[PDB]
Design a protein around this ligand. Structure first.
Ligand code: MPV
Ligand code: CL
Ligand code: CL
Ligand code: CL
Ligand code: CL
Ligand code: MN
Length: 340
């Protein structure tokens, strides 16, 4: 039967079921005030599916010049056509290959560039902004979004949204690599999974996705949702409370020193965006510093709400198109203030 909501992460994560329910705020606001992330399912059912396909991006924008990132080694592939990314999104026999002859795992960097999403793709901009959940928080002019109402004493977010496009990680060795490394933002954000590409035939890797979820830190209800099939899993997130950010910095300074890095005692390994917490490092964080996080699998149409100041990282299980909007809720405005 239909219900308003359910819990994941052993009761520590709110999951809202109806993205356009006018009463969502009554359930959301207490979890949000406590500094928790929140998940909202079903946003894909609200969107125009034909606007969010890889083949349409390639057809409309394919002659644009872009840079890619090789996720496995952070090498930059400079000044190639955006069709070279999109045509290999799902069809592995069309993907760029490294020197070893293997298909690469690529991220499309800064596309659309800077604040250009609305100008480059006005129909996509409308379809997304009209269907975002918790619209009093997330719309540019929502009553609980302070972004347009704050003086220069506050760091203000860029004009959005921003698109995040990358292939899925494939191999056992790939399990320890991030799509987006551990970092934090001084604004709140909502991140929507608008498309998941699961390759079939020549380069299918469904076995190692299932091994990754079964051997990892996800909850039993999350593990249930994977094994049911039915919905397409996109990306594995780890999110940490803003209050735990300095303990995470302490662990990463200690690990950097063990690995013979030479860093000043005050350097900020979260701001550097150079680390992915693999299973070893997540267990050490819990055992040695007493810090627990939230392990979240973002399926097609799931919106992840990330609180300002919360360290987070992302690992794509399959090829993903994500679209994210920054906002400034009153609950977390302290994180962007420029004094004390
Ligand atoms: C590999 N795989 N494929 C699926 C779906 C395909 C179409 C709907 S759901 C779910 C998983 N885990
Ligand atoms: Cl907070
Ligand atoms: Cl458009
Ligand atoms: Cl709302
Ligand atoms: Cl990154
Ligand atoms: Mn982020």
């Amino acid at each position: 039967s239909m219900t308003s909501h359910s819990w994941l992460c052993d009761g520590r994560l709110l999951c809202l079921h109806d993205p356009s329910n006018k009463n969502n705020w009554k359930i959301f606001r207490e979890c949000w005030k406590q500094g928790q992330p929140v998940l909202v399912s079903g946003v894909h059912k609200k969107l125009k599916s034909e606007l969010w396909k890889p083949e349409a991006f390639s057809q409309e924008f394919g002659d644009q010049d872009v840079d890619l990132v090789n996720c496995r080694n952070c090498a930059i592939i400079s000044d190639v056509k955006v069709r070279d990314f999109w045509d290999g999104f799902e069809i592995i026999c069309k993907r760029l290959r490294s020197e070893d002859g293997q298909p690469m795992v690529l991220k499309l960097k800064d596309w659309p560039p800077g604040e250009d999403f609305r100008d480059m793709m006005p129909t996509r901009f409308e379809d997304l902004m009209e269907n975002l959940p918790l619209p009093e928080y997330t719309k540019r002019d929502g009553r609980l979004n302070l972004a347009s109402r704050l003086p220069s004493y506050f760091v203000r977010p860029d004009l959005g949204p921003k698109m995040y496009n990358a292939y899925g990680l494939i191999t056992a060795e790939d399990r320890r690599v991030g799509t987006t490394n551990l970092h934090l933002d001084v604004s709140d954000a909502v991140n929507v999974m608008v498309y998941v590409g699961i390759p079939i035939g020549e380069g299918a890797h469904d076995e190692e996705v299932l091994k990754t979820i079964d051997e990892g830190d996800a909850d039993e209800v999350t593990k249930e949702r994977i094994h049911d099939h039915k919905e397409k899993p996109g990306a594995l997130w780890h999110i940490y409370a803003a209050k735990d950010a300095e303990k995470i910095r302490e662990l990463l300074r200690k690990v950097g020193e063990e690995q013979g890095q030479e860093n000043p005692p005050d350097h900020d390994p979260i701001h550097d965006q150079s680390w992915y917490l693999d299973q070893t490092l997540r267990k050490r964080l819990y055992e040695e510093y007493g810090v627990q996080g939230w392990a979240i699998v973002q399926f097609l149409g799931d919106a992840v709400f990330i609180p300002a100041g919360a360290p987070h990282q992302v690992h794509n299980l399959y090829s993903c198109i994500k679209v994210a909007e920054d906002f400034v809720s009153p609950e977390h405005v302290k994180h962007c203030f420029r004094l004390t």
